[PDB]
Every structure is written in C-alpha cells, then in structure tokens.
Amino acid sequence: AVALPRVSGGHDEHGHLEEFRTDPIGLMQRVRDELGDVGTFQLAGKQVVLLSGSHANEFFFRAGDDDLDQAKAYPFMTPIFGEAVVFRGEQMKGHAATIEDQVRRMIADWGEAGEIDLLDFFAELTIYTSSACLIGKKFRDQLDGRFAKLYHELERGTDPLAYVDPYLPIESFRRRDEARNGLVALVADIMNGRIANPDRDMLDVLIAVKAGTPRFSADEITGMFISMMFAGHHTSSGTASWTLIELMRHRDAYAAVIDELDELYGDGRSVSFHALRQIPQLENVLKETLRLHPPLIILMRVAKGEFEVQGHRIHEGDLVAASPAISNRIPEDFPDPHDFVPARYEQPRQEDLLNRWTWIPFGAGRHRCVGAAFAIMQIKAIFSVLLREYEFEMAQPPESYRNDHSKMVVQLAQPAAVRYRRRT
Ligand code: HEM
Ligand SMILES: CC(C)[C@H](NC(=O)C1CCCCC1)C(=O)Nc1ccncc1
C-alpha cells in the first residue's frame, strides 16, 4: 500500500509520458538524482520502476523469465513484426568477409572526395550487412535503397505513445503500417522474380515449405525477415555512426587507430582474419562510444511477482526498467563519466569488466547480448575498410551531432554531415 518514491513533474495528461517522448534521458537521470537506485515515473496508466546502480542492476539482470518478463514489456513491436511473429563461431569469418564486401560495395561510387550523411550511409549499409549475413547474399543482392527507406519508417513507428495504444491515428503509426505493407510488396516482387528468373538462401528455404499449397505468404515471410533483422539494425547503424563521430572528435584516438590498422594489416591477412582478432585502440574507442551512446537507453520488463530491492517493494505487473544511458555514466563507477576516455578499458583499468552490473551497453547476466561478438566484429570490419581507404572530417560543429530520442528506437539525428577524401 506504500507508494514507491515518484520522480518530480509528470503533471501532463499521461503523467511522465510526454517528457519520456521528448527527453527520456533527462527524465531517467532525474529519477536517479532525486530518488537514488529505485524510483518511479508514470507512463500513462503504467508505473515504471527504474532501477540503477550496481545492486539494483544485478537484481534486474540476474532475474529469470519467471521473475521479470521481457517480451510482455514490448507490446508495441506487434504491428512491426506482424500477427504471426509470436515473440556461430564457424560462420563468423565468413560474415566478416561478407561485411567487408558490403562496405566496399557501399563506397564503390565515392570517388576521390565527397560528403555523406552518417544516418543515410550507416542505415543503408547495415541493411545490406544484416540481410546478407542473416538471410543470404542472394537475398541482399535483390535489395536496394527502397528496403532501407521502408525499414527506417518501421523503426520510426515506435513512439512511446504506443504504450497508450499502438494504433492511435497518428502519422508515425500510419507510416509504420504503410512501411510494413511496402516491405511485404518488395518481398513479394522478389519471390515473383525468383519464379521467373531462376545457390540458395533462407528465402528459398521458406518458399519451399508446403502447407501442397505453399505454407508461407509474402506477409509471413516478411515478418520473419523484419524480426530477424531488427535487433542488430538500428543498434549497429547508430554505433557505427557514433564510432566515426568520436574518432573525428578525438583526433589522437583516430591517429592511433590509423597507425594500428596500418601495422596490423601489414601481415597481409584479410579483414576476415583481422576483424576476429584484437584491434586494441579501435576496440577501446568502440567500448567508450558504447558507454557514452548506448543505442538501447532503457530496457523494459514486466514483474511476474513480488520482489524487494533496497527495501522497496516491486509488485507483479509493475513495469521494471534498467538504463544503460544512466548506468553507464554513474560517476562512482566511471571516473569522469562524461569524458571520452578509451584508456579506461586498457588492462590497468578494465572499467567494463570491473563494473559488471553498470557497464551495460550490451546488457548483463541472463540477458547479455547474444549479438555482441557479431556487432563488435562488424565495427572492426567496417572501420578496417573505411579508415584505410578514406580520411574523414566533420562538416558541421562537433557538438552538433546528436541522437533523436523521440522514439523507443533511438536514431542519429540529421544533419550528420561528414566529408571524406581518399587516403594517400
Ligand atoms: C551494437 C549493437 C547491439 C547493442 C548495443 C545491443 C544491446 C543489447 C542489450 C542492451 C541487451 C540486453 C537487453 C535486455 O536486457 O533487455 C541485448 C540482449 C540481446 N541482444 Fe543485442 N544489441 C546489439 C546487437 C545485437 C545483434 C546484432 C543481435 C542478433 C542478431 C542481438 C540480439 C540480442 C539477443 C538475442 C539478446 C538476449 C535478450 C535477453 O536474453 O535478455 N543484439 N542486446
Ligand atoms: C528495444 C527495441 C524496441 C527492440 N526490442 C525488441 O525488438 C524486442 C521486443 C520484445 C523482445 C525483446 C526485444 C530492439 O531492437 N531490441 C534489441 C536490440 C538489440 N539487442 C537486443 C534487443
């Protein structure tokens, strides 16, 4: 009957929802600043118990699906995956080679010098890497920029208003729904193309299954492919963007990465060899970029039961959340937490390893990211190519690069303009 501590503000119609839709990171920080390790905010009719700090995070991440339910906290993903999506080491070398090929293909028309937008570039690139690795090169080769454009609209369909109702007549939801129909149409044209113009991939596997009448429709197959690509797409896309931004903002780090790439590749081995082995300075830049710009800024659960955390009672049906955005910057755990300090991961400090429950850009415990090794390899492969072929400079003030946090799916904001010039 005791109310949990509640953060200030949230006097709008849906409580803190409006703030969560505009500045979720400031809201979550205020929870911690006012209340400490366990505090709440109101998301429309739902209480969110926001945990932070080592002890509370440990509870969150060590909880089994019996205690804290992940999938129930994401009902808004239903219109994205669709009705019927009811939610290896031996391959990695091949995937690194695939990634190298996709990056070379993306920069093939760059020429001597030019300008890119990082969101446009990395969003499209990572559609190709994800589709090629997860579904097949044959399928990627039947994709072009339209698939990326549509997939982006789908991701933009995750306004937190979806916690009120995911089918409200707002434009972002209408565009989410239309984008999904557009993706189904692309997949149907691909299926038809294969009939008329017959080396196999997962799409071939799915087409072959019989109910015989074919078992799966374009709609069903498309939902499967959307779901397969979702976790790794915006996360990898944003991380690649922020990696390049932070290298440009910190030229000393950029210079060290260049030297090391040039030294490492001097053994004559491929990207598929080196992307699976240490590239130390780049890896520490990546760790720091993830600490500062975690693409998942909040992680949601529904409590299945009663638990106590620091003498605060969580009850069944409470939404319960952790936040990499906030936890990754706890100043007692990460000295100078707003500063970009790749040295914090060198053997002497290992701040990622020592702070097991608060360095959480890839989660922790029971829910440690199963895609982390792939995502890390993919950054290594991408930058092994980009940084050896081209030099990059910022085309706008360094502090003006920023994320759009208005949707549950975080995206780099535009402009994110960067110039390149061939390395001599
Ligand atoms: C840089 C890219 C990525 C980041 C920052 C990231 C982040 C995370 C985070 C924060 C969690 C914990 C989720 C939670 O506790 O609710 C997680 C778990 C997970 N991620 Fe990722 N992820 C990335 C890429 C990927 C990729 C490429 C895949 C696979 C295609 C993937 C699949 C998963 C899976 C299967 C889990 C386990 C969920 C659980 O058991 O709790 N992720 N990831
Ligand atoms: C947070 C996003 C809305 C999105 N979440 C999801 O796609 C799932 C919803 C239900 C099952 C858990 C996650 C997502 O991209 N999640 C992940 C991305 C990565 N790695 C792990 C999860």
Residue numbers in the entry: 3 to 89, 106 to 216, 222 to 234, 237 to 449
Passage from the reporting paper:
Azoles block CYP51 activity, resulting in decline of the normal complement of endogenous sterols and accumulation of various 14α-methyl sterols with cytostatic or cytoxic consequences. Based upon crystal structures of CYP51 of M. tuberculosis (CYP51Mt), three of the thirteen active site residues, Y76, F83, and H259 (numbering according to CYP51Mt), are invariant throughout the cyp51 gene family. To verify this assumption, we determined the binding modes of second generation compounds containing the N-[4-pyridyl]-formamide moiety by determining their co-crystal structures with CYP51Mt.
Compound 7 was not found in the CYP51Mt active site in the crystal, which is consistent with lack of spectrally detectable binding. Compounds 8 (3-{[(4-methylphenyl)sulfonyl]amino}propylpyridin-4-ylcarbamate), 9 (cis-4-methyl-N-[(1S)-3-(methylsulfanyl)-1-(pyridin-4-ylcarbamoyl)propyl]cyclohexanecarboxamide), and 11 (N-[(1S)-2-methyl-1-(pyridin-4-ylcarbamoyl)propyl]cyclohexanecarboxamide), were observed bound in the CYP51Mt active site as predicted, through the coordination of the heme iron via a lone pair of aromatic nitrogen electrons of the N-[4-pyridyl]-formamide moiety (highlighted in gray in Fig. 2) and interactions with the invariant residues Y76 and H259. H259 hydrogen-bonded to the carbonyl oxygen in both compounds, while interactions with Y76 were mediated by two similarly positioned water molecules. The residual Fo-Fc electron density map suggested two alternative conformations for compounds 11 and 9, designated by pink and cyan respectively in Figures 4A and 4B. In the CYP51Mt-compound 11 complex, the cyclohexane ring protruded toward the bulk solvent, barely interacting with the protein in two alternative conformations. Together with the limited interactions of the isopropyl moiety, this lack of contact explains the low binding affinity of 11. Although racemic mixtures were used for co-crystallization, only one enantiomer of each compound was found in the active site. No binding was observed for compound 7, while the KD for compound 11 exceeded 100 µM, indicating weak binding.
